[PDB]
Amino acid sequence: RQWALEDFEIGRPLGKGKFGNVYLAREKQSKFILALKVLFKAQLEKAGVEHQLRREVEIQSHLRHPNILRLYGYFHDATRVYLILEYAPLGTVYRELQKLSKFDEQRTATYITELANALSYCHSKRVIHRDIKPENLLLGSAGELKIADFGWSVHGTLDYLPPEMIEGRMHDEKVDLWSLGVLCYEFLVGKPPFEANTYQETYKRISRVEFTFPDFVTEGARDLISRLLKHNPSQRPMLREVLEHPWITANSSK
Predict the structure, then answer these.
(1) Domain boundary at 45, 73, 91, which?
(2) Are residues 21 and 106 both part of a single domain?
(3) Taking the alpha carbons of 233, 234, 235, 240 in that order, is the dihedral positive or negative?
(4) Which domain range does residue 60 map to?
(5) C-alpha closest to that of 177 among 219, 223, 131, 126
């Protein structure tokens, strides 16, 4: 007996798919614009077990940072689950990548700075993500990056998974440093570093950490990406060392 669908006005469809739909919406009383993610119960319980996608609402809801999409709350009815999300007006980093082909150094460094900050905050809360793709990075009103509520897709690939995870071995917070490296590279080059024609060859490249730089990538960029993509998790840097890297501080606007 709290938040309910009747408390909202529904707008245009942001996305539709096998698991549900997402719509623009506005709270009747307040009239504030937001997004409403509608998930079909017949899918959660069936496969994506409600277990995995449940309490994670309480953990996610407790995350409050300018670079993390806010989850205001949630509610349900007989057949659906409703997530009340912050609305990101400028779209995904993914679409922007389709548009520009590749980003410049100033834009790449700023984005990495905003990500490292969100991730450092998440670590202090004992929250670790499992692969972050360009399509899961939304853009705020001022153009800032927002890491979207990890999970709850409506319908991450092998290209973004660190070695320890695809190999089945143990993984920890250092998985986030590897992600940072795949992204930095993708922003500057236009495609992820281990891309291949088959899952077979992709795995091989990720496993053996096989990547190369086009001629236009700078030594400063090449040095950061190289420090981040270390097969051994322990060799990867702390998030603080990334925020203080000479190439970041030199091209970032903070």
Answers:
(1) 91
(2) no
(3) positive
(4) 3-91
(5) 131
Tell me 214's DSSP state: -
H or E, element range at 166: helix 163-166
For helices 175-189 and 105-124, angle between their N-to-C axes, nearest 10 degrees = 160
Residues of the binding site for ATP: 18, 37, 86-88, 135-136, 149
Give the number of other CB atoms < 10 A from CB of residue 107: 18
7: Cβ contacts below 8 Å, ≥ 6 apart = 27, 28, 29
How was this structure determined? It was done by: X-ray
Cβ-contact 88, 144 below 8 angstroms: no
Catalytic residues: 131
Determine contact, residues 214/129, Cβ cutoff 8 Å.
Answer: no
34 residue type, one letter: L
**What's this structure's resolution in Å?**
2.2
